[PDB]
mmCIF file with all atom_site columns, C-alpha atoms and ligand atoms in Angstrom:
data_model
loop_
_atom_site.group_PDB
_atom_site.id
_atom_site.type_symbol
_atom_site.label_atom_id
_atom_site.label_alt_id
_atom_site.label_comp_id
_atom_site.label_asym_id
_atom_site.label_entity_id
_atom_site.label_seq_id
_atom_site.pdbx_PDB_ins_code
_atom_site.Cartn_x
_atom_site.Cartn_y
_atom_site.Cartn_z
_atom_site.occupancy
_atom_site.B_iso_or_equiv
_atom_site.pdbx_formal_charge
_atom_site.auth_seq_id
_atom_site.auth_comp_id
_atom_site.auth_asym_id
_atom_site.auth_atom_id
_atom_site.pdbx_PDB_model_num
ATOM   1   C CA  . UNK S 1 1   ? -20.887 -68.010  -36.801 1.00 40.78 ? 1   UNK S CA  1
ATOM   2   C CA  . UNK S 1 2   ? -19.453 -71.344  -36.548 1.00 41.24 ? 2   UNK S CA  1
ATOM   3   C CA  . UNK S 1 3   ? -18.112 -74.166  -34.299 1.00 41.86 ? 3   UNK S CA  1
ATOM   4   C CA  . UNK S 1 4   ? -15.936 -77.022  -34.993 1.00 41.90 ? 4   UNK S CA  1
ATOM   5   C CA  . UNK S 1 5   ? -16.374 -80.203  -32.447 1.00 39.30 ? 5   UNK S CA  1
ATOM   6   C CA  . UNK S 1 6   ? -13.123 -82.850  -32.999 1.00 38.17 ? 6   UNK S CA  1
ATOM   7   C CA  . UNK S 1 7   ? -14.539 -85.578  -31.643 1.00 34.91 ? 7   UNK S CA  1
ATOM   8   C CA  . UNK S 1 8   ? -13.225 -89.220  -30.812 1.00 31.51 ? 8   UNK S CA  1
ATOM   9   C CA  . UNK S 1 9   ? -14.311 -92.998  -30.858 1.00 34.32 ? 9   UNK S CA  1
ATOM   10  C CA  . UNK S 1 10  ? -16.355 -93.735  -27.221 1.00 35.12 ? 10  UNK S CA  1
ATOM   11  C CA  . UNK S 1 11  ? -14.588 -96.293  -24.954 1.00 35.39 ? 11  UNK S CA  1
ATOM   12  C CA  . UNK S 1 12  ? -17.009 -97.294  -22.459 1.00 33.86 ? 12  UNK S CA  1
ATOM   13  C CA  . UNK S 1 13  ? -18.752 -94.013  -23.198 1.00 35.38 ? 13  UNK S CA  1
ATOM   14  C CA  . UNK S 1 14  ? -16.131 -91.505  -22.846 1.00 33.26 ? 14  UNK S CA  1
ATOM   15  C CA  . UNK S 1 15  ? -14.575 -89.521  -25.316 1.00 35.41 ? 15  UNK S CA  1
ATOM   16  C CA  . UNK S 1 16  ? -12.910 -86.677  -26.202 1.00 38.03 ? 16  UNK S CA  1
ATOM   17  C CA  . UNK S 1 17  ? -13.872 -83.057  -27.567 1.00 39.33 ? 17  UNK S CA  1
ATOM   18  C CA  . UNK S 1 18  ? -11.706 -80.499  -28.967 1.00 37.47 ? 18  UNK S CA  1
ATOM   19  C CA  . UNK S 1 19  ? -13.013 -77.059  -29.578 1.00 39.13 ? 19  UNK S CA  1
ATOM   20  C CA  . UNK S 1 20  ? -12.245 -74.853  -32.910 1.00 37.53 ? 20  UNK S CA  1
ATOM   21  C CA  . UNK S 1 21  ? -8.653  -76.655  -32.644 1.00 37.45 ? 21  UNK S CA  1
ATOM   22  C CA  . UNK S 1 22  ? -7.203  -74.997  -30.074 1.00 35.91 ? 22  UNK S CA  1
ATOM   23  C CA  . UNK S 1 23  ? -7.831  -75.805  -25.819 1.00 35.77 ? 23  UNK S CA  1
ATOM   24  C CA  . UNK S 1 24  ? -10.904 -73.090  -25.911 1.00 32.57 ? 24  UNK S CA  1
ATOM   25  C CA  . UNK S 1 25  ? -13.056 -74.378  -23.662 1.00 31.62 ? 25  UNK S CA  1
ATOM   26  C CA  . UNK S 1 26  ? -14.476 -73.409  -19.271 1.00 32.88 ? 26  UNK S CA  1
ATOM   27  C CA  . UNK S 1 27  ? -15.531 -75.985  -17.381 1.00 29.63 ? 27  UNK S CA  1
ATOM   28  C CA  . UNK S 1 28  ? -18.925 -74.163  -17.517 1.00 32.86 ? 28  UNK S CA  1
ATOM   29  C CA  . UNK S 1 29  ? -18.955 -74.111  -21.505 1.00 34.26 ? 29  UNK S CA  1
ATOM   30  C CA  . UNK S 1 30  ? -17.739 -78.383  -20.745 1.00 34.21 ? 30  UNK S CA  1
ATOM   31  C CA  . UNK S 1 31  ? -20.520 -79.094  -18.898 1.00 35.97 ? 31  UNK S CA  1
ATOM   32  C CA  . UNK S 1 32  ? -22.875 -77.732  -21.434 1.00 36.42 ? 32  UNK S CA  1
ATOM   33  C CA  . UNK S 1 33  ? -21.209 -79.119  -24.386 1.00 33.89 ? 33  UNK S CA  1
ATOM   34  C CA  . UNK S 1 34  ? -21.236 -82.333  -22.962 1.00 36.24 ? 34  UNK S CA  1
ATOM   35  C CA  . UNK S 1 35  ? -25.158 -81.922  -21.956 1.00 37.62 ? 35  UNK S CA  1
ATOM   36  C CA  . UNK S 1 36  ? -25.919 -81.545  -26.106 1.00 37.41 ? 36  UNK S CA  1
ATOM   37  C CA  . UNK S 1 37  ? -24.726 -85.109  -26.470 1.00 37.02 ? 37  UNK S CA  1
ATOM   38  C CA  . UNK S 1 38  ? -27.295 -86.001  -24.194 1.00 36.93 ? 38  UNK S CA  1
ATOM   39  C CA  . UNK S 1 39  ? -23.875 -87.009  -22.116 1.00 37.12 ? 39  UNK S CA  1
ATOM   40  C CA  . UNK S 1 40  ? -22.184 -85.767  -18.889 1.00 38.60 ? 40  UNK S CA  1
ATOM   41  C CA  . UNK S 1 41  ? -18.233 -84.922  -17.430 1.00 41.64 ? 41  UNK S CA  1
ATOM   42  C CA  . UNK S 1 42  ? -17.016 -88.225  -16.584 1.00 41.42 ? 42  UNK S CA  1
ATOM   43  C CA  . UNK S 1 43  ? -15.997 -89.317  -13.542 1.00 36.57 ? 43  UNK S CA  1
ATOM   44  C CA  . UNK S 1 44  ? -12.675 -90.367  -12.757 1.00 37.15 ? 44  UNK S CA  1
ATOM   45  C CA  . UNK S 1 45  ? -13.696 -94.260  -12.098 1.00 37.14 ? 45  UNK S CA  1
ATOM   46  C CA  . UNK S 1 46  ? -15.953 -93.956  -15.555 1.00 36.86 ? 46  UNK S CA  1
ATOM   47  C CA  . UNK S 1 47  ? -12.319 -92.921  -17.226 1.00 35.47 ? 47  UNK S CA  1
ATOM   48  C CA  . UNK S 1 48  ? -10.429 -95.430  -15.873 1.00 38.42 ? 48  UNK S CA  1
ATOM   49  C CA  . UNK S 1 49  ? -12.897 -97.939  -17.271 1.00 37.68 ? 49  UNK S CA  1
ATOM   50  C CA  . UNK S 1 50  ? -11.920 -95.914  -20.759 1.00 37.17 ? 50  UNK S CA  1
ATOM   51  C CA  . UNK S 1 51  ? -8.251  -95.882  -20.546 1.00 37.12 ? 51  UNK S CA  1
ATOM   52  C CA  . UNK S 1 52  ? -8.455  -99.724  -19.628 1.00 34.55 ? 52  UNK S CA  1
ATOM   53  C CA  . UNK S 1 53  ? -10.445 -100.386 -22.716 1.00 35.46 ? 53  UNK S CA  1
ATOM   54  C CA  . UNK S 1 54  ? -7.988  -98.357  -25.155 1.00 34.64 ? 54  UNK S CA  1
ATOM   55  C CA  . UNK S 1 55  ? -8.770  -94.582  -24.633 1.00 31.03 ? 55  UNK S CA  1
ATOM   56  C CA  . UNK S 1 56  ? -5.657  -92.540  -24.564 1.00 30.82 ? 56  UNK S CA  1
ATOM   57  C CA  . UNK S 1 57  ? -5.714  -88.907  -26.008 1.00 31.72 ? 57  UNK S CA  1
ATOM   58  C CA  . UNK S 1 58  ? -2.476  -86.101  -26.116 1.00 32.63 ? 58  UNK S CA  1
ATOM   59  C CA  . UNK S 1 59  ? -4.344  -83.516  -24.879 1.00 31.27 ? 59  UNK S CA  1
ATOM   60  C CA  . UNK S 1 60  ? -5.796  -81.861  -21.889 1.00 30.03 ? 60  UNK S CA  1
ATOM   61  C CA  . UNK S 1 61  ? -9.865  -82.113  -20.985 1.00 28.40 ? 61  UNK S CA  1
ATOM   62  C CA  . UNK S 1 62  ? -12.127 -81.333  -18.110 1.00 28.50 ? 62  UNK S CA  1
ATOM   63  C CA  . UNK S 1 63  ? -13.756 -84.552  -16.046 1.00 26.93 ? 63  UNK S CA  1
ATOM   64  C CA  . UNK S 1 64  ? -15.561 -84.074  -12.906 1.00 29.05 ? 64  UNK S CA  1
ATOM   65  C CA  . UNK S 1 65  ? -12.961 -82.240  -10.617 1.00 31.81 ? 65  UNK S CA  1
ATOM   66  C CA  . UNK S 1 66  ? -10.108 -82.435  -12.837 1.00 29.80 ? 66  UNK S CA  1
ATOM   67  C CA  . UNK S 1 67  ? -7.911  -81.543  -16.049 1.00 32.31 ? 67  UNK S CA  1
ATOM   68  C CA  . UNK S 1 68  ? -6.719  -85.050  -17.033 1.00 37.09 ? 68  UNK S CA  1
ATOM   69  C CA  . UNK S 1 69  ? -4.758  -86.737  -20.002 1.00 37.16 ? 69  UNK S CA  1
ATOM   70  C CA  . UNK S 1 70  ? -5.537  -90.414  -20.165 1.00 36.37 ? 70  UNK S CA  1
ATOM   71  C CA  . UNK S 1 71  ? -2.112  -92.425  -21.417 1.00 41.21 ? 71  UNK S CA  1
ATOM   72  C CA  . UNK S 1 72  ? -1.447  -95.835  -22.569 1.00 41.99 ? 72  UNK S CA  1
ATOM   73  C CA  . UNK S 1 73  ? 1.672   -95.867  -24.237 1.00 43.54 ? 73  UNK S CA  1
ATOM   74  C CA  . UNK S 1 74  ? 3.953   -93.517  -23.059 1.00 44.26 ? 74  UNK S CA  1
ATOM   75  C CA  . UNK S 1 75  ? 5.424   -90.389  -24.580 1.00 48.03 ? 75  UNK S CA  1
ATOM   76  C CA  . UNK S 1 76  ? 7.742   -87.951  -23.769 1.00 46.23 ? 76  UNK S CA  1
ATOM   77  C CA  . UNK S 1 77  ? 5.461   -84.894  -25.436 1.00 45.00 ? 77  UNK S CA  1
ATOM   78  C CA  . UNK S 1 78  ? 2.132   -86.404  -23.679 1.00 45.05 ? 78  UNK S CA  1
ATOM   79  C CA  . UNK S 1 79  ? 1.751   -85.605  -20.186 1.00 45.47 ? 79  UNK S CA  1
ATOM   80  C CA  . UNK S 1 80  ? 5.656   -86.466  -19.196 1.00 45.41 ? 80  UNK S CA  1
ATOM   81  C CA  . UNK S 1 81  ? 5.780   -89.728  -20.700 1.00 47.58 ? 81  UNK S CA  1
ATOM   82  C CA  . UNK S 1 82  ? 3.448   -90.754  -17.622 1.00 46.76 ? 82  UNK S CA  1
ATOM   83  C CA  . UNK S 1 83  ? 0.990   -93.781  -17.953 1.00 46.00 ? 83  UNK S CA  1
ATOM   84  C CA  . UNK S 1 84  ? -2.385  -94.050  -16.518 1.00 46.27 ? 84  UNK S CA  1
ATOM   85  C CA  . UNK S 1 85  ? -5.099  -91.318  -15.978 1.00 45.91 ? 85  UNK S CA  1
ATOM   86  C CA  . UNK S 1 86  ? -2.586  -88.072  -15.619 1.00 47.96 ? 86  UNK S CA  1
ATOM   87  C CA  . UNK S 1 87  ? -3.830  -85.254  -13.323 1.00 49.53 ? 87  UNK S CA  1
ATOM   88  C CA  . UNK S 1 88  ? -2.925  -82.166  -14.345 1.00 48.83 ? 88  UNK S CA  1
ATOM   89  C CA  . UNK S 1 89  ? -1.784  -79.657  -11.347 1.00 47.62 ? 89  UNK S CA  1
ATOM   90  C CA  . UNK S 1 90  ? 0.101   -76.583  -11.688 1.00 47.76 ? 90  UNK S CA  1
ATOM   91  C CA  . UNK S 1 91  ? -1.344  -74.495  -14.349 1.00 48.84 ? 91  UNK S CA  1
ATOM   92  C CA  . UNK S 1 92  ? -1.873  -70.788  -15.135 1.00 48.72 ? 92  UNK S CA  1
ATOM   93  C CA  . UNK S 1 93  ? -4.829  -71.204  -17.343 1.00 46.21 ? 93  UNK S CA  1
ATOM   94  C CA  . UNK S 1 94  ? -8.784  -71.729  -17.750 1.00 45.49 ? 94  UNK S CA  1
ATOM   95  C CA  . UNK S 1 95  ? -8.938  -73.232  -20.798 1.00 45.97 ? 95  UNK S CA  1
ATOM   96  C CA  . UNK S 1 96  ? -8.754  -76.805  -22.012 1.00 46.62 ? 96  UNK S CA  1
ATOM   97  C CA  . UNK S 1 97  ? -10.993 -79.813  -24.103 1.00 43.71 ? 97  UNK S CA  1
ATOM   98  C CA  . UNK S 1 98  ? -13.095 -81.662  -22.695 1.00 42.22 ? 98  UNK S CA  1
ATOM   99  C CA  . UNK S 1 99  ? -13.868 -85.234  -22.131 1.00 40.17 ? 99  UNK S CA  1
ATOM   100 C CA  . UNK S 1 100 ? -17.579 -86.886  -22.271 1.00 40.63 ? 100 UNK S CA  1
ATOM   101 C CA  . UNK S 1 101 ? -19.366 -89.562  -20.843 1.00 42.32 ? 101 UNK S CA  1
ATOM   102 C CA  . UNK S 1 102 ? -22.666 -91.153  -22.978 1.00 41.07 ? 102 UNK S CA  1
ATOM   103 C CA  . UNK S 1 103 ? -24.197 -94.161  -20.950 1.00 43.59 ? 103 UNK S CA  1
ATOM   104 C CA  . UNK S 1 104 ? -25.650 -95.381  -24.058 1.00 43.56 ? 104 UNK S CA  1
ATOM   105 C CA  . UNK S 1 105 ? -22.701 -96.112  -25.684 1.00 41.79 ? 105 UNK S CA  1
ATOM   106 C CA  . UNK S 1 106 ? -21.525 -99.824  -26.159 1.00 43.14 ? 106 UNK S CA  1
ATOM   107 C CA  . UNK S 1 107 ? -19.261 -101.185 -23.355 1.00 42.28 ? 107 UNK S CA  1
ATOM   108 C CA  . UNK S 1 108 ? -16.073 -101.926 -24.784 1.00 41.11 ? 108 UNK S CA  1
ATOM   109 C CA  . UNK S 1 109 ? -14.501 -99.682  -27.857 1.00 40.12 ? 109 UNK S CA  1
ATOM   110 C CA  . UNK S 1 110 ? -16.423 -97.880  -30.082 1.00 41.50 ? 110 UNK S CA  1
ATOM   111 C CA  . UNK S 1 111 ? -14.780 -96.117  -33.000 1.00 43.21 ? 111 UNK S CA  1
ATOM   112 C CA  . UNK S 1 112 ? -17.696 -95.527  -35.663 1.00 47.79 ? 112 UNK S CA  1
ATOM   113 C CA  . UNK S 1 113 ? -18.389 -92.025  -36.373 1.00 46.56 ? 113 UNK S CA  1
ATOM   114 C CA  . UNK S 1 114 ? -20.535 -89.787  -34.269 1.00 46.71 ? 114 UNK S CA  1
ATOM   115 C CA  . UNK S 1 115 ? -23.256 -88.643  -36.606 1.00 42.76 ? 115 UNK S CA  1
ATOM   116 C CA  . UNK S 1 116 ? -25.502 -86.316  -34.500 1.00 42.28 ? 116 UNK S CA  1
ATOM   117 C CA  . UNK S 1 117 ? -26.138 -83.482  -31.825 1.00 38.44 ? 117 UNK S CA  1
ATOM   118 C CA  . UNK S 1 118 ? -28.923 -84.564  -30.231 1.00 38.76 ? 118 UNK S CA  1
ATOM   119 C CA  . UNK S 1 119 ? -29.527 -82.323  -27.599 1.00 39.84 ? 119 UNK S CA  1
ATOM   120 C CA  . UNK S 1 120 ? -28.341 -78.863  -28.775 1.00 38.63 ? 120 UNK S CA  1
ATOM   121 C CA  . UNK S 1 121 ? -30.927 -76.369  -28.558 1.00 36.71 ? 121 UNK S CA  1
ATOM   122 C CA  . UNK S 1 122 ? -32.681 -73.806  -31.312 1.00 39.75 ? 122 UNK S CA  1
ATOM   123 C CA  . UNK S 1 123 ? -29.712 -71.308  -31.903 1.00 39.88 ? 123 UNK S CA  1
ATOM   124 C CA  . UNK S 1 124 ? -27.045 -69.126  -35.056 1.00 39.25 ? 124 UNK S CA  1
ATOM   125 C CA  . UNK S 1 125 ? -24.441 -71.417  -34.472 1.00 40.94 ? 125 UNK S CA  1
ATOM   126 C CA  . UNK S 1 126 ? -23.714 -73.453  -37.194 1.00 43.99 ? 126 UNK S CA  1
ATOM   127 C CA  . UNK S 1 127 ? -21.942 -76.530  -35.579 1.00 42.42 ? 127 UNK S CA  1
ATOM   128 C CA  . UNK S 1 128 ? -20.066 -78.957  -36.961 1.00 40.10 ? 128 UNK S CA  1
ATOM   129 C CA  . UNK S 1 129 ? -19.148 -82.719  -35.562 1.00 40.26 ? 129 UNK S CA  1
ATOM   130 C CA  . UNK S 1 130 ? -15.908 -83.230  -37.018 1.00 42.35 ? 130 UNK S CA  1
ATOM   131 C CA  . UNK S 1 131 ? -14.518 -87.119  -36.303 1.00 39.89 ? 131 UNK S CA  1
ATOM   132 C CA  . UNK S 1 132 ? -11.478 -88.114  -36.838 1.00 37.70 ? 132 UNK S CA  1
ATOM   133 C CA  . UNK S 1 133 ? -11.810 -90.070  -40.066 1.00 35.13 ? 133 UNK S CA  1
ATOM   134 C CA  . UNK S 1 134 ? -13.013 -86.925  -41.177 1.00 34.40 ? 134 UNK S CA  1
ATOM   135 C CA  . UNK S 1 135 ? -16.621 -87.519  -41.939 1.00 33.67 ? 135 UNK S CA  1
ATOM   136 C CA  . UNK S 1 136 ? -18.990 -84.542  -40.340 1.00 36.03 ? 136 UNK S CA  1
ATOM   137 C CA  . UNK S 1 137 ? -22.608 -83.363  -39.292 1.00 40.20 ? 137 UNK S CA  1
ATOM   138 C CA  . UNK S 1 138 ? -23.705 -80.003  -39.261 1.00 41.65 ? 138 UNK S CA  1
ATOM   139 C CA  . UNK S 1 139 ? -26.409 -78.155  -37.923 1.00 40.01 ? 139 UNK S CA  1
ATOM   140 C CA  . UNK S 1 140 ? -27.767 -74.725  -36.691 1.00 37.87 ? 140 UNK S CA  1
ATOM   141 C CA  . UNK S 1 141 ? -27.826 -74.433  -32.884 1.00 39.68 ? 141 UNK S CA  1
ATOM   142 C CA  . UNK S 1 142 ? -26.523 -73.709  -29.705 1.00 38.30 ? 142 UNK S CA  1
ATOM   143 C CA  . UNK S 1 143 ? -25.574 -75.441  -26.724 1.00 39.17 ? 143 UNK S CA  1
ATOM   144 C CA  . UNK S 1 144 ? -23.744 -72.819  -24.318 1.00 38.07 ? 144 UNK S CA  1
ATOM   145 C CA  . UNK S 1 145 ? -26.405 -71.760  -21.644 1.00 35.22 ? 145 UNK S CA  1
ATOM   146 C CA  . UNK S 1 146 ? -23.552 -68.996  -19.963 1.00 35.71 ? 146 UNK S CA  1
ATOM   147 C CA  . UNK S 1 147 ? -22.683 -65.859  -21.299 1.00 34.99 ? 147 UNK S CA  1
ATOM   148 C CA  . UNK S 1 148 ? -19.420 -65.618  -20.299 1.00 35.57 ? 148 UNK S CA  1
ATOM   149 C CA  . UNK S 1 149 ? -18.867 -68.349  -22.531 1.00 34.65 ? 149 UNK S CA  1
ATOM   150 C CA  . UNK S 1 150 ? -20.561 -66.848  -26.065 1.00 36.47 ? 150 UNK S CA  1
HETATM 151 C C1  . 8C2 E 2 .   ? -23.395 -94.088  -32.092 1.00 38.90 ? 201 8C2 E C1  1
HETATM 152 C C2  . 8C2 E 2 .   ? -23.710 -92.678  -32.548 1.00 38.90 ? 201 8C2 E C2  1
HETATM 153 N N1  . 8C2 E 2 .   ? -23.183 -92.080  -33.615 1.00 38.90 ? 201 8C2 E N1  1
HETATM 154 N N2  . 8C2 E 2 .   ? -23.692 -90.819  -33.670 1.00 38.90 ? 201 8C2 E N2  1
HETATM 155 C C3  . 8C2 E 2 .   ? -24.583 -90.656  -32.743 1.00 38.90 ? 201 8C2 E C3  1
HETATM 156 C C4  . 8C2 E 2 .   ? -25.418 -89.419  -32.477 1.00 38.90 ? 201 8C2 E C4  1
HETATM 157 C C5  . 8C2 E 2 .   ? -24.648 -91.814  -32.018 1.00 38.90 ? 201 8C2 E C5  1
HETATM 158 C C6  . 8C2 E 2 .   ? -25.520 -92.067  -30.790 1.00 38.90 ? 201 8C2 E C6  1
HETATM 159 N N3  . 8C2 E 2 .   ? -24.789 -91.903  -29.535 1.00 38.90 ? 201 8C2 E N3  1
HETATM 160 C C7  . 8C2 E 2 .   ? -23.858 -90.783  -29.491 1.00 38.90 ? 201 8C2 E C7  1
HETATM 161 C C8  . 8C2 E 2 .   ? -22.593 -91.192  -28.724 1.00 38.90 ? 201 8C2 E C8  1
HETATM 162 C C9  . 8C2 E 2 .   ? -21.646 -90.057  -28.280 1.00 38.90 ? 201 8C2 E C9  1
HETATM 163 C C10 . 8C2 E 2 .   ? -22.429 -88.816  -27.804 1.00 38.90 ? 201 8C2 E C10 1
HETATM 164 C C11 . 8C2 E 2 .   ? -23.581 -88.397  -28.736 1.00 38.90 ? 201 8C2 E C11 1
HETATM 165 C C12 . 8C2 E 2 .   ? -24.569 -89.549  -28.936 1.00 38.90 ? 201 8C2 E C12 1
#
């Protein structure tokens, strides 16, 4: 009874999450996730702030009202070698990442390691905050507060 969390550095508090590497997350199961790092969907002016401060990603993640791919640089396998915060807007499927929004976190880039899950709740689940450098932080919870998501 695990779960994997890929996370990324913060850029003006926004990052990104990837699920058990694969797009496996609702927006429901998003909105919770986000919520156990005391954090919240960002909105699309808070990720503009992060893609003009650095933040680009390759994959797909909820915000508030959208699936989006912020791009810098661009790159015929991310989002159609488009720049700027891409919208996604035909699509068959549910399932995606999700990006995060923590007010707390410092203004400009931030790529130290995320070290805890501060708001999950008492759960089985033994979660694990994988960053990309590789270091990690386990422990047993739960943050999912639908059951259509467990
Ligand atoms: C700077 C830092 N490293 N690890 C932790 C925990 C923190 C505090 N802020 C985080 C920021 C991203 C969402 C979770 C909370």
């Amino acid at each position: 009874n695990q779960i994997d969390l890929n996370v990324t550095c913060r850029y003006a508090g926004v990052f990104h999450v990837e699920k058990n590497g694969r797009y496996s997350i609702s927006r429901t199961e998003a909105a919770d996730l986000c919520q156990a790092f005391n954090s919240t969907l960002p909105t699309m002016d808070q990720m503009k702030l992060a893609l003009s401060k650095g933040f680009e990603t390759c994959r797909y993640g909820f915000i508030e009202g959208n699936v989006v791919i912020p791009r810098i640089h661009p790159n015929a396998i991310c989002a159609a070698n488009h720049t700027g915060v891409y919208i996604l807007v035909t699509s068959n499927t549910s399932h995606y990442d999700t990006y995060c929004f923590n007010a707390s976190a410092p203004p400009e880039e931030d790529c130290t390691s995320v070290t805890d899950l501060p708001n999950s709740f008492d759960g089985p689940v033994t979660i694990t905050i994988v960053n990309r450098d590789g270091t990690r932080y386990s422990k047993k919870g739960e943050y999912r507060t639908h059951q259509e998501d467990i």
